[PDB]
Design a protein around this ligand. Sequence first.
Ligand SMILES: [Zn+2]
Ligand SMILES: [Zn+2]
Length: 314
Amino acid sequence: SAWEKGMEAARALMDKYHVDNDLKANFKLLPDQVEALAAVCKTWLNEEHRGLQLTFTSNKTFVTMMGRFLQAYLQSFAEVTYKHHEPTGCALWLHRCAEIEGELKCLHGSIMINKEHVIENVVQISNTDARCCVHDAACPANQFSGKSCGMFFSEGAKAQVAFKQIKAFMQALYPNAQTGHGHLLMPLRCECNSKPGHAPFLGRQLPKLTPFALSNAEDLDADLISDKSVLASVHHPALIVFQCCNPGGPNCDFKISAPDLLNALVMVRSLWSENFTELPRMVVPEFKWSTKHQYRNVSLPVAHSDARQNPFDF
Ligand SMILES: [Zn+2]
Ligand SMILES: [Zn+2]
C-alpha cells in the first residue's frame, strides 16, 4: 500500500530524530497529523542549524510550515493524497507587483486603486499613498467589501519594495532558472483555517499580507557587502509579512515572512535529501482567484439619532 510506504518514511525520520514516542505511536498519514512532522523538523533544525535567524516570523510558525512541507514530500513520495486536504497550505501567486514602478495588483489580478485617507482641531492621519482592491474603491476608509480580496495597503511604495525584495531575494537563491521569479510562495491558511472542516469565520479568508519595514535600522550600513541575498533586503528595506487571516471572531499568532517561508521550503528539501535518496516532485498549487477567498463582511444598517418622537409628518 502507498500508505505503508508513507508510514515507512515517516517512521524512519521519526526514529532517527527521536520524536516523542507518543507522537510516533499515534501516527498515521492523517492529513491533520502535522505535529509529528514538526518535531522531526524541530530536532533536525536544532542539530543542523541551531541559531537560525528568522526575520519577522515566529518559531512555531516556521517549524509548523516546515511540518507541512515535510507532509507534502511524505505524501508525494508515497503517492498518497487526500481530497480537499492540500498539505502545504500555500499557493504560488503570480503577483505582477514588481513590474511597473508604483504599480501594485491585488489577488484579483487587478491593479490596486489609489485612494487618499483623510476626510474630516483634530488628529488627522493622512494616507496619500494607500492602495485598495478594485472592489473596494467605493468603500470608506479601509472597510472591505463582500467581493474584496481583503488586500489593502496604506503605503503603496513600501509594499512595492517588499515585493521587489522577495523577487530579488528569490533571484539570489535561484540566479539561473527557466522561470520568472514572479511567483510568490504564500500561505492560504493560518491557524484559523488550518482545517478544511472549520468553523466558518467572518473577515479576511486568507492570511494577511503585510509589508514590514527593515530600513529602520538596516539603512545603517551598505557597500561593504557582497552576498546577493543580503543585498536584496538592503536594496529593498522591506519584507512581505504574512499574519493571521485577521489580526470579533478567531485570531491566531501566525507570523512568517516571505523569505522565511521560502526558506522553510528549502530547508525541508535539504532535510529530505539528507535522509532520502531522491527528492520527489512536489507541487505547490498555482494561485487562482475564487470566491472561496472573497472577504466575508457582514453589512448592517446603522441607526442615526433623530430628535424626533415620530418617524414622519402627517
Ligand atoms: Zn482584489
Ligand atoms: Zn489565524
